[PDB]
Amino acid sequence: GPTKATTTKLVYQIFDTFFAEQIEKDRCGVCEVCQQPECGKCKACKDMVKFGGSGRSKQACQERRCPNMAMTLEVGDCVSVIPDDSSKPLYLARVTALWEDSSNGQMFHAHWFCAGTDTVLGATSDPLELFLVDECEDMQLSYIHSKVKVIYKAPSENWAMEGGMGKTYFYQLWYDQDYARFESPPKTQPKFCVSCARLAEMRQKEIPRVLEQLEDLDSRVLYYSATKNGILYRVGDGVYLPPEAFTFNIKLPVDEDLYPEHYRKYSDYIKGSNLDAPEPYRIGRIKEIFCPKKSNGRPNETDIKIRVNKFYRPENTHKSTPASYHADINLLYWSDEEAVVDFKAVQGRCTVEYGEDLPECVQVYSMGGPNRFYFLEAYNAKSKSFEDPPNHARSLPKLRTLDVFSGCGGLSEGFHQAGISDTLWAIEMWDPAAQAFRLNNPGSTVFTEDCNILLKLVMAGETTNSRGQRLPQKGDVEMLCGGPPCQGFSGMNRFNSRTYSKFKNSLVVSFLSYCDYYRPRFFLLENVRNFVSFKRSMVLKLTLRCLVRMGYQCTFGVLQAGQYGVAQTRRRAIILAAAPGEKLPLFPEPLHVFAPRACQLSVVVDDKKFVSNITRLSSGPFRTITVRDTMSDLPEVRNGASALEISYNGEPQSWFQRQLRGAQYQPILRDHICKDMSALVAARMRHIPLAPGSDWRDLPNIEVRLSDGTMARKLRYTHHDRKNGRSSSGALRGVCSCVEAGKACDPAARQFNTLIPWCLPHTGNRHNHWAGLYGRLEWDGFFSTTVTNPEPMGKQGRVLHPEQHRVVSVRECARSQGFPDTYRLFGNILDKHRQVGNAVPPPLAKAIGLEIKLCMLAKARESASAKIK
DNA sequence: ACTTACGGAAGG
DNA sequence: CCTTCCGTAAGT
Ligand SMILES: Nc1ncnc2c1ncn2[C@@H]1O[C@H](CSCC[C@H](N)C(=O)O)[C@@H](O)[C@H]1O
Ligand SMILES: [Zn+2]
Ligand SMILES: [Zn+2]
Ligand SMILES: [Zn+2]
Ligand SMILES: [Zn+2]
């Protein structure tokens, strides 16, 4: 069975009543009733201090009875402000100024606090915690109800060792409401409202301004540089532009008885289709920044314009989008075509280098930093040719990381190639995943052990495990990464209310107890997207509450993995936490353009929408990775492949394949092995057409001679489906007595050995017609979310090869996840598929790791600048 | 060990 | 109304 969650007392007292039967024991507060705010109307609410009462009586609100219970004024001090309607609680403010405004009366400047019940924490927060917000306004002194004592609960100097342990308002963190960020209080140097200073610094970062005038002309004036959103651009720099900023000179009835299920295809929406993905950014080289002169004879310093030399992508030339198949993802062509755009349109700065002018090689230059492009040739669109460009065209220590619920190590691998971490410890109960981690991380300690048992060992002074493996003590772990089991949070689990999924979900508590005990600098929790909305977003709320209770800067978000370099839709919830002395990391900007339907990443918690700090919504520097970029070089293999190590009959064909294979010649291809489906499943896969969007619904209703001694029989429609109606020939469409609403199934309408699987028309009407089951991938599209078992009749069943009559291999699944072709998997084909489908795609972990590297560099620079004072 | 039959909430 | 998609019990 499953063990109970090991807890510190801090985490226990928060997750107490939620996992009442799952955490090891030694007003529930979490029900839907205990989560709504106080009413404000009743004589109970108007007697607690939040609404301007006495408070001598407790008298809980008369809507929050849990169904699980038994039954002078001087600047610098904080005050209460009563709003119009009394049902909203007292607004807590700080006095930043106390001027006497003539003609208006006594006045002051209120810098607002945010109560904990007004944040993403909701009712989970304690009624005394406050949060700093950039919210101020001038109010009359007629509004002060009373003077409030507010304390600044700072983290101690031994905060990193406080894992394991009145009635005045306190605060520790600043709150950003748009992104639900909890950060340290901003160090702002001196009225002096802090919110006013921060908003004034923000408003003078929004405004683009030209700098260092270059040459004065009659109708305009050139400038050498400009600045926008804190980014400085000069003449000759590369700029990102929206795909609409300029243009290129290159001119851009079935047989319903043969196919009785084809009628269920009436949406025309194709899973994994890239026909609606946007174009990547336009790339320009700034030839001149200029401002037009007003009628007064001097420049308009707000109408900043830039002239730009256009760059072509290989898919922008006359040739075709096939030109993008083998080309580099950051390869361009120089053009002598120019375009004038506005400075407000620029989406960022890039680097466009002439290829054979570089001191490095273009392969080492391309991996050096972000936004790096190169070109070798100039494109002539009027003659549709390529020449060489003209002359005016040329010219920290690693964190010590503990990975809990490691698996095969996709998150650790992504963090390792980001250069930020050194995974020294891994906890992985499942033995094949632990062996894969040992094969991919020869210098780590993998604990093949339950995380609860190991945490209970380390919270006592045991210092070593049974096999004699040195456990990590507090002080060893600078980074704690992990993805706890998602099986109880997934939207595919239809038994998520049973003890199995309860004990799956209780491992988030174990992970948070690791975070509490070890107090690392950085903490990463990864889960499926449904982690943020499971059980009314209460697990997310309680996790963020635990984090802010420890004293952590924390933030949550959702990231689409395909926006970072994989041909796969995979939306994942990410929780980032930083110790009080750190910078809270930002989530990474999308690198590749991805299908807009796969990019819904906002999170609604308690009827409030939270986004991430991401700004790249539509476009991006790079083009989408496709199925052909992923597996167009893997040789032909058959259903039920068993040969582990085979040959690469050829070289890589796309940029993605060169990235995943490398440059050193390795003619060994491992794990291009497919599941061995039965004869009926094989005949079904044989009869799925090759056209895109093909799935079980264009199966033929014929009898087929299987490979074994069996004839797959014909599906019979024995009942009338009053919702689907009848076919053109008058044939029925129901397969069980369930089709008549208000009737039970019949244990005689179940039909076996059919080419069309009976269960799919049986329950298709309430399951989106099982769209995608026995579905093929298209070469121009992307994968669907790679799960631990590619099953053509699974909930995610779009796993058929584009051309071959089989299921995607282990190599193709690892490539849809962004795993290097040298990454080691272990066990039988099911173990390998499970390792691959459980992992975090290494490109996503690499983007997040670079965002953590930013904060590590920032802290190091701040230490240096405070050391040479 | 293998194969199938398949609930319901959230977000657009 | 349609689409999502780290999968689970139960049968065999
Ligand atoms: N109680 C527990 N103790 C230790 N490991 C556990 C566990 N429960 C589940 N696991 C492991 O957690 C793993 C899933 S997380 C593994 C994938 C990881 N996100 C990655 O990027 O590679 C599974 O392999 C499972 O064996
Ligand atoms: Zn009340
Ligand atoms: Zn309750
Ligand atoms: Zn102010
Ligand atoms: Zn039925």
Numbering used by the authors: 614 to 639, 652 to 696, 756 to 849, 860 to 884, 891 to 952, 963 to 1105, 1136 to 1609
Text lifted from the article:
DNMT1 is an essential enzyme that maintains genomic DNA methylation, and its function is regulated by mechanisms that are not yet fully understood. UHRF1 recognizes hemimethylated DNA via its SET and RING-associated (SRA)7–9 and catalyzes double monoubiquitination at K18 and K23 on histone H3 (H3Ub2) which, in turn, recruits DNMT1 and stimulates its enzymatic activity. Previously reported structures of apo-DNMT1 and DNMT1:DNACG/CG revealed a dual-auto-inhibitory mechanism in which the RFTS domain and the Auto-Inhibitory Linker are embedded into the catalytic core, thereby inhibiting the access of cognate DNA. Our results reveal both the large-scale displacements of inhibitory modules (RFTS, CXXC, Auto-Inhibitory Linker), as well as more detailed changes, particularly the switch by which the same hydrophobic pocket, initially bound to inhibitory phenylalanines, engages activating phenylalanines, which releases the DNA Recognition Helix and permits catalysis.
In order to understand the detailed molecular mechanism for DNMT1 activation, we have determined the cryogenic electron microscopy (cryo-EM) structure of human DNMT1 (aa:351–1616), stimulated by the H3Ub2 tail and in an intermediate complex with a hemimethylated DNA analog. The target cytosine in hemimethylated DNA was replaced by a 5-fluorocytosine (5fC) to form an irreversible covalent complex with DNMT122. 3D variability analysis by cryoSPARC23 revealed 2 types of particles: Type I particles with 2.5 Å resolution, in which the CXXC domain was ordered, and Type II particles with 2.2 Å resolution, in which the CXXC was disordered. The atomic models of DNMT1 were constructed from the two types; these structures were essentially the same (except for the CXXC domain), therefore in the rest of the paper we will focus on the Type I DNMT1 particle, with the ordered CXXC. In this structure, the RFTS domain, Auto-Inhibitory Linker, N-terminal β-sheet of BAH1 (aa:731–755), and some loops and linkers were invisible, reflecting their flexibility. The structured elements of the ternary complex showed that the catalytic core of DNMT1 bound to hemimethylated DNA, the catalytic loop (aa:1224–1238) recognized flipped-out 5fC, and the Target Recognition Domain (TRD) residues (Cys1499, Leu1500, Trp1510, Leu1513, Met1533, and Gly1534) bound to the methyl-group of 5mC. The new position of the CXXC leads to a structural deformation of the BAH1 N-terminal β-sheet and induces a different orientation of the BAH1 loop (aa:765–775) (2a center). These structural changes then lead to full eviction of the Auto-Inhibitory Linker from the catalytic core and causes the Auto-Inhibitory Linker to adopt a highly disordered structure. However, the superimposition of the CXXC:DNA complex onto the ternary complex structure revealed major steric clashes with the catalytic domain, suggesting that DNA binding by the CXXC is fully suppressed when DNMT1 is active.
